[PDB]
Subunit: 289 residues, 4 copies
Amino acid sequence: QDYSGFTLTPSAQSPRLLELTFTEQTTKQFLEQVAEWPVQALEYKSFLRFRVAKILDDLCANQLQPLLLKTLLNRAEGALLINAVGVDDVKQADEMVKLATAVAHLIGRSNFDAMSGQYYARFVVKNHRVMELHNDGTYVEEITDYVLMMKIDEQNMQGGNSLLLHLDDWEHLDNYFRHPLARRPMRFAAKDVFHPVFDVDQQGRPVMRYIDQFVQPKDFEEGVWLSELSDAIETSKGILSVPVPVGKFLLINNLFWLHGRDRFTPHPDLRRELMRQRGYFAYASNHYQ
Amino acid sequence: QDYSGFTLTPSAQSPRLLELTFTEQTTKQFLEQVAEWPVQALEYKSFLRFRVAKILDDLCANQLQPLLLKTLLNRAEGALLINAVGVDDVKQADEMVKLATAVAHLIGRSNFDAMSGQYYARFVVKNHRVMELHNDGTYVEEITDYVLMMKIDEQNMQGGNSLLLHLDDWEHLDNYFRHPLARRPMRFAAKDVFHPVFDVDQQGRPVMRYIDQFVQPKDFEEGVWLSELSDAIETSKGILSVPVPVGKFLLINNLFWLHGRDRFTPHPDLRRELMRQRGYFAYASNHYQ
Amino acid sequence: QDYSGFTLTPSAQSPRLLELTFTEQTTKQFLEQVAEWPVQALEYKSFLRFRVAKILDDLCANQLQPLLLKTLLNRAEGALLINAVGVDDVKQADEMVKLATAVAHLIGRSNFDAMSGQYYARFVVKNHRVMELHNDGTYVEEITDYVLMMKIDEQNMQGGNSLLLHLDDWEHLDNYFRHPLARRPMRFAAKDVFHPVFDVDQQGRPVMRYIDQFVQPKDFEEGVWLSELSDAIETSKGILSVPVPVGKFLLINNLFWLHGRDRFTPHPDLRRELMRQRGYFAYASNHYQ
Amino acid sequence: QDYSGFTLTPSAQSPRLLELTFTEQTTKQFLEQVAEWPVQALEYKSFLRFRVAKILDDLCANQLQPLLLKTLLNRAEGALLINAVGVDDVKQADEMVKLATAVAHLIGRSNFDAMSGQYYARFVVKNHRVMELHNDGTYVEEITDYVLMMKIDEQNMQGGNSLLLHLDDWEHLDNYFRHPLARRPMRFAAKDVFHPVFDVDQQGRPVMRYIDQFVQPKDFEEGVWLSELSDAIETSKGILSVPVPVGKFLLINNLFWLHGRDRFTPHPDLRRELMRQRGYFAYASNHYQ
Ligand SMILES: [Fe+2]
Ligand SMILES: [Fe+2]
Ligand SMILES: [Fe+2]
Ligand SMILES: [Fe+2]
């Protein structure tokens, strides 16, 4: 269909990854209407995160929030690459944070990031290897429903695409899901938590909560299996390789998408800045009370 | 009426805010009788806080403690601006702390202040924006019954009045109090605590436990409402603007008064020193055992 | 009677305070027999504290341990001033610690001292006011049964005697013990603990757990009473003033003795070093199992 | 018998201590096959510890894991001295860690080492006294089943042999095991834990959880007994004195072996580097579900 304030087109890498682009009129109006709250105001007063969310959704005739929720919750999709025309330079990092915040807080709430002390975190990489596919939030009890990763800056960067794996594109899903250890609660440590690497959604379809660094196999049986699982994920033919240009961000359902990052070329002048948010879904629906 | 040791007159800003002034004979006698305990003695031995309280009340023929309790607990009032003639210069900061301590510990006990490590805290501001109305103690389980804010120093200060809002002067009270989210326990974080923004006193009248920085709306529904609540409070026509000259302190019922601070003019030589205490009420009354 | 290895004579200040002096043959033999364990060995391996205790008691034909327990547990007494001939100079501080350790671990076990990180602590004072009478261990749940305070060094020291008050020499005991607030559990804070300032021993006789710095009266009623209690203790005619020369230590029952320290004369060359241990009683007795 | 990939011969010190030596073909093949995972990879992803374990066991035709478990669990034995030909120089410390990791994770899992922050720890000693026999893990609730101690470097080292005591070579075992205090839970502190110094295996045979530094006797009775126990262990005629050359490691059952270290000669150029791992057993067996 045709949407108010933005366009939605499938990506070249996969029909499951949809590209959402806010128009120029939508973008400059949003930035104008949220100009009176700097990013530090969003940091200090969390309800402003929801206020700028509403402002953005209002500028899209309230078509954005239902579209975001539909896409992220659709098992067939669950992934967005989002950008706003005119917001594509590192000098607009604050506008980038505002826009991502507004998008994230239409579908839920972003959790505290221990590495930044805020509801979002920015990293710069300077001075090489593939970051293996994984889910976020595997070492805490609360489920992380979504991962938001935004490219703030990118200079002298060859490679480094975001890697994505939708569980239903993973050719080995059934082999590992049907193994008894898939249901075995395992220890995860950054207090420790225990949960299986696999679970099911409400329909019985597999979801995952996996990362190689924080899973703690208790014995030879668990360790060998996890090392085979790791291999079966990293060599999967279903992995997507997605460039994320400055100003764009991926927003993915953390339960049936795994994400990672490809190796990049070391270069003295290399600078890549990322912004991340992770949170849970929260939305109105017709259900029992 | 006429009181022993002090005078009580309504303020120019509101009949709910009463000005209590200790006479010169009362003030110099109190300071004499408490001279043997410096402020550091009140810090180290908390029962001395109550001893100087009794000394002050005794010098007022025991009319002070019942008057303080009557005023602070009276829904129609609940707020005092207190001073002592001759105590009006920053060089008398210790006398100021002693006097405020004696007053506070006639009606209750001042709680530990994490920012100072003592039962009171002093701030100096040097080197601009309005501090929004709020209640203290919203992020701990124990109720903060009273807020004490004392002007220790003020130099080259244009503006910066204390802002006050009595809930019964808030023209939007019923609109927000009657909303279902008014009774929804929300998360507050500086361990997290959960409580609604609104509650009731013993008679069913609204009281509040609100601050925009520490309330953590869990979703879009809560966030938008809190952002409207914030606006409805900050633009209320009922807000009082009270100058607090050096040596005076506000003492207010933290349950149905919100407090804040107006914007002030930045000035190189600007110095404003404040002293704060927060605590709970504790007092004798005829009730069942 | 006549004891093996030591003498026992009443002090000049009170028949309740007994002076125990280890003879020269007892002292040099003990130091010889414990020479192979330096103080740091007693710090690292707590069972050595009991080994040197046994060694000392064995050198007294096993008359020391029963005498120590009898004296410390006797309501009429409960206090010892202990020394060993030839151990009276700060250069013998390690011998002092060994001797005090052996004595303490015949009657119980010394608790971890947070200020030193060991089962004992040494302080030096250099660069004035009376330290009010009190019990130790009032802000933890476990009862501190005994206090051991040893004079390691004393130079250019006028005054500074240890102050002692046996509850049965306190002329106001009955007045405060019979007050309802004597049985009121009050908050003590250095996690907080709650216990009354007064309690009873197994026979119903008053014992105390009081210090002015850490008791936290919750309201005007408790604060005024504690401030009167404090005054009634500090002005008691029953207070003993005991010089503690280098090499001597007081060992007192912390339940019915309060201890403190008199004011001393400031002097540029003043140096006083103390060693303290606090612990619980533990001893064999004929009782039911 | 004859094993695939390694040889097994009894030590000169005791038939209970078996020497396991990986052949050159086994060693160079293992190092080749695990070359793609550096030690830091084993630190960050614990399942790789089990992957290199399997790789090593596969190179021994799967005869290694059952042999390791049989030996460590055999009451008559329970101790291995393990090495790999060609791995005997401090410059091969990473190969040493890889090999020890593979061995340890065939029989169980190595626990987090608080002193290193990793599943193993390396110490260097430079700049004298005997380290008394003891068990590891006495101050936590979880049982430490095995201790792994590897000699990484040794220069200008006279003495310093590892000391070992198998409980069934301890001529005083029955005397202390039959004492009532052997079954008395005692306090151990580095939260505190309580457990007896002695326990039994599944057959009722004594096992121990003892160290002199962390056991905290509560009274004279416990302290004197522990000090006699300590003496009876340290003077036992059953103690083995085992040189551990660079590249070799002891792997012992921590329940019925105590370990320690002999005094060594201080020397300006002395350098000895050790690597330790401690963990629990975990292995497949036929038992009820
Ligand atoms: Fe991630
Ligand atoms: Fe405030
Ligand atoms: Fe004391
Ligand atoms: Fe050890």
